[model samples]
Target: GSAADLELERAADVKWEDQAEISGSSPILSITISEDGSMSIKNEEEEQTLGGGGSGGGGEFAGVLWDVPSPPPVGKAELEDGAYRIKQKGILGYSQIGAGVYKEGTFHTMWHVTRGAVLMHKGKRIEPSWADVKKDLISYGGGWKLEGEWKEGEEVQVLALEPGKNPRAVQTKPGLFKTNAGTIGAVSLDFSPGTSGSPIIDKKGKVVGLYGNGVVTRSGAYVSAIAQTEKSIEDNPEIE
Candidate 1:
């Protein structure tokens, strides 16, 4: 409801090594929006666990893209380097899912929700042939380290972004985030569209968290893609 809940966004402007500046503290290391049209800084001991509202050992979070146009497909978006004049802009910043981090294959990434890929084709009109770009996504998103998991009250290494730049591993920690719709796991860093899909690589060089508000728990979808490639190439005669 107000701008002060913007902890993650404001933290990005300070130097990465500045722990106090990177996460902030007025008594709380992080803040949570408990519900719609409201903001409350509650006791960390109580609001910190996934124990209330539902009853189960394991439940699934609906990773969905609602009320949006069709996504352009998850694929490589080839564009000239530094070519922004008028209509020469596309999405940037994707997170790493290291090889063997989840499955047997090359490294991987997950960024900016499903709708982020919407309108990715040139001129954005979207035809059937536009589906070809998804093949290129594999290479463009390859080669980045990832590992680790969530731990309460522990400092985390997050790969957030700076304005006019790409993702870089920064330091921070995770807090209990309560939205009306919520894994409640994510690091808030900086206020810009560019920083939307950053990753958190642990001290041991494994992915532990994500800062994109996107914090995809998030380390297995690529192995699925490998099989899709094997089948797509072997079965189709038009794979070039």
Candidate 2:
């Protein structure tokens, strides 16, 4: 039992402060660390309390387990400058759904969006129009009571724009359809760094959409948004 405890302590990144609890510990699970830096502790239906030591507070992370297919493959690509890129198949022109990063033996990435307007369209000057965007929101079943710090009739600046072939709408699931066409909408902070997962709200503080994909060119850059992200997460608790 002492040898097993020592192995578990090593796997947990334990410090000298953890020795007291270890010497008198009574845990049911077996803990092990993987080469990928992820930790696994077999609970076997028994509850265990993990202390943070000192002044750090601990919290519970409970969720249901669901079986799903494997995740998409992540690859690396070299760019023109010193910058490198990570690409996964099925996303648009080197686009990723969220933000990510590579760090100390691990890659951590997140997604975010900004508050801006469209400056140009297809390499030409174009006015910001919200008519089609609002219609699309209504079509997507949005009550659209705005939230956050945005105004009711404020004009946002364009960040980026990409001209692509007219996208066709295709239904990928039951009663659900997707399109590659450019749609105008406010992006959430949750879609970008510093603002990752932040809600794009209207004057009424209601969440409207989220930012995810992006594009860059000599002219400028642009982002993409969808109005129904909250609903999707609510209806499907285990989305990812």
Candidate 3:
């Protein structure tokens, strides 16, 4: 646990910090609001006295939203430098609903869109597998990584975006899962269409994985473990 914790501490803080919710620590200073969605701030070090055994503060991280352009609804996008090259049609670009994951280092989001069970690479058309996609993402100074210590029933931040609209991030709980897609995670948030390939971030602001499949209502989107994604690129093979 200490070794894993050390790695997280060493990873990019400012970039990932936005994804971390203000999970509460010991003591409490509840602020019941009566306004149009805003929180009141208070510190615990000065003066505070309230005792509750285990009140893991709800992950309530809300700050700046990543300006990840929602992928076109129809046809795939040829991920280019900082911009998504619309493959199928024009105006149709914004209409499509898919998640083009964002990573650290680059000021712009990485335009990685997957559909019809096929993905893109190096400005080329579908190579046809996620392993191909992950392999590409890992190269070229990909500071983005798979969180290694994530366990079942952990807290995470969900970012689901829409076309011509701002990305909305909500804090939610997730559980380790296994599907035909292999080992991934899922959160019960009833997310919308633009969720697949979306970032599934851990409390430390590290992206543990990307969203996979999901169900509606009493259900949430599935996640592909970053560790698994990285491993796929290795074991799944290349010309090697």
Q: Best TM-score goes to which candidate?
A: 3
Per-candidate TM equals 0.33, 0.20, 0.40
Model 2 local distance difference test score? 0.20
lDDT of 3 by residue, 1-240 (tens): 110100000111112334333321112122222241222222221211111112223111221112222267853533222211111212222122234442343211222332222222212333222223322232222233444433345566655432333334556565433333343343444343333334555556555454443323212222222222332224434455
Model 3 weakest lDDT span, ten residues long: 2-11
Clashing pairs in 3: 72-96, 73-96, 212-222
Q: Write down the lDDT that model 3 would get.
A: 0.31
In the range 102-216, model 2's lDDT, one tens digit per residue, is 1122211122221212211112222222222321221112222222222213322111101111111111111111222221232211111211221222222233232233221
Show model 2 residue runs off by greater than 4 Å. Answer: 1-198, 217-219, 230-240
Query: Per-residue lDDT for 167-239 in model 1, tens only?
Result: 3445454444445564233343332222332334555544333333222111210001011122223244544
Q: Residue 87 deviation, candidate 2, in Å?
A: 20
- Roughly what TM-score does model 1 have, to 2 decimal places? 0.33
Which candidate, 1 or 3, would have the higher TM-score against the true structure?
Answer: 3
Per-candidate clash tally:
8, 36, 3
